[PDB]
Design a protein around this ligand. Structure first.
Ligand code: RCB
Ligand code: MG
Ligand code: MG
Length: 360
């Protein structure tokens, strides 16, 4: 289709996240904060498939969404994240991941995608929006000095193209991850990013199902900054809107008229980072701008909550195999559990600090 893929759809509410929120609310003693916590389970989030053992769960969500659709007659849209490349998260320790290129990682990744595809095939009547491999391509632009990233370059591109070709053949709408304003928004990185995204789009066959890009995944940038965050100094693109408005024309000239979705899940509190490159469980974050199709620009299909607030970005335990020093910074919330696991203290702050505030 030509238009906004989200238009006219009810957004399927993650049962995984609802259950986490339900249990989290139960542990909050403040009745006001408890009631606000419970509102969060009604806010649409993206469902991450960060491990291949989760692929059968996609079938379960799509069956559930299909049943809701058939019961109510209201079209359902399921939001998912493809996040399992071999040598994943190559500039960091926190979200390492289960596949290694040293151990048949590439083939195992294709199989992971194939399993995702086999579930989608069983439930063709539900629309799916997928974010493709957060951080992957952003690392390819910026971190070829990092041995793991340099070694992963061919596999990242191959893997992302495979996923895109396989999902596009199933009518899945993809948004390829594109870092954020403080990553690829820098003039050092814009043009090279535009070139890379255009290349992936091309090699993936230029399917109309490849709708565009996703920004600010698991990050904290403002969409449109009322006051400039001191941490953004030197970068003219100091919010996601500016980043996108600088990127979109470049990418267009490079052969792709791309549309955008923006994570605002943990963007409610600005001015909370000592450095812009600090990403791990940043202290005092709040739930941000709610998912909506009323965006400030025609390039932007939707504001979304891609990273589900409350799930950790990485362990702060200096003894743990996945310990990354970003997770030990003075402006990280500590002690933090393993990436992807529930982080109660952190969730409690997101609710309390939410902007706009959550209602009862
Ligand atoms: O003015 N100049 O002249 C000039 C010259 C060169 C410049 O270089 C740029 O400097 C930037 C910092 O300003 C760097 O941005 C940081 O890069 C990190 C990766 O190394 C990212 O971390 C990821 O974050 C993800 C969540 O978003 C995590 O999920 C993931 O695990 C984690 O790895 C940070 O967000 C991101 O902010 C750029 O790479 C770098 O190219 C900049 C300016
Ligand atoms: Mg500058
Ligand atoms: Mg992460």
């Amino acid at each position: 289709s030509t238009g906004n893929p989200f238009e006219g759809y009810d957004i399927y509410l993650s049962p995984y996240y609802a259950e986490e929120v339900e249990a989290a609310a139960a542990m909050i003693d403040d009745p006001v904060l408890k009631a606000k916590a419970l509102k969060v389970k009604e806010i649409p989030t993206f469902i991450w498939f960060d491990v291949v053992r989760k692929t059968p769960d996609l079938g379960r969500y799509l069956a559930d969404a299909t049943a809701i659709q058939q019961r109510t007659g209201r079209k359902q849209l399921v939001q998912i994240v493809v996040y399992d490349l071999p040598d994943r998260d190559c500039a960091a320790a926190a979200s390492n991941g289960e596949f290694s290129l040293a151990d048949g990682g590439m083939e195992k990744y294709k199989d992971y995608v194939d399993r995702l595809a086999s579930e989608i095939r069983k439930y063709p009547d539900v629309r799916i929006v997928a974010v493709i491999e957060p951080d992957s391509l952003a690392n390819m632009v910026t971190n070829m000095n990092v041995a793991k990233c340099r070694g992963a370059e061919a596999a990242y591109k191959e893997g992302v193209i495979y996923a895109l070709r396989q999902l596009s053949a199933l009518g899945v709408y993809s948004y390829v991850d594109a870092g954020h304003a403080g990553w690829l928004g820098w003039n050092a990185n814009l043009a090279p990013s535009a070139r890379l995204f255009a290349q992936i789009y091309k090699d993936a066959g230029r399917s109309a199902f490849i709708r565009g890009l996703a920004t600010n995944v698991s990050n904290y940038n403002a969409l449109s900054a009322t006051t400039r965050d001191p941490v953004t100094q030197g970068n003219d693109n100091y919010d996601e809107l500016r980043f996108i408005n600088a990127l979109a024309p470049l990418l267009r000239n490079e052969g792709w008229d791309a549309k955008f979705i923006v994570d605002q899940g943990r963007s409610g509190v600005q001015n909370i980072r000592q450095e812009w490159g600090n990403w791990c469980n940043v202290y005092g974050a709040g739930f941000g701008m709610r998912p909506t199709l009323n965006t400030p620009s025609s390039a932007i299909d939707a504001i979304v909550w891609i990273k589900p607030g409350g799930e950790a970005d990485g362990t702060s335990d200096t003894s743990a195999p996945r310990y990354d020093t970003h997770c030990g910074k003075s402006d990280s919330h500590k002690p933090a559990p393993e990436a992807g696991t529930w982080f109660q203290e952190y969730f409690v702050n997101l609710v309390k600090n939410a902007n706009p505030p959550l209602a009862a």
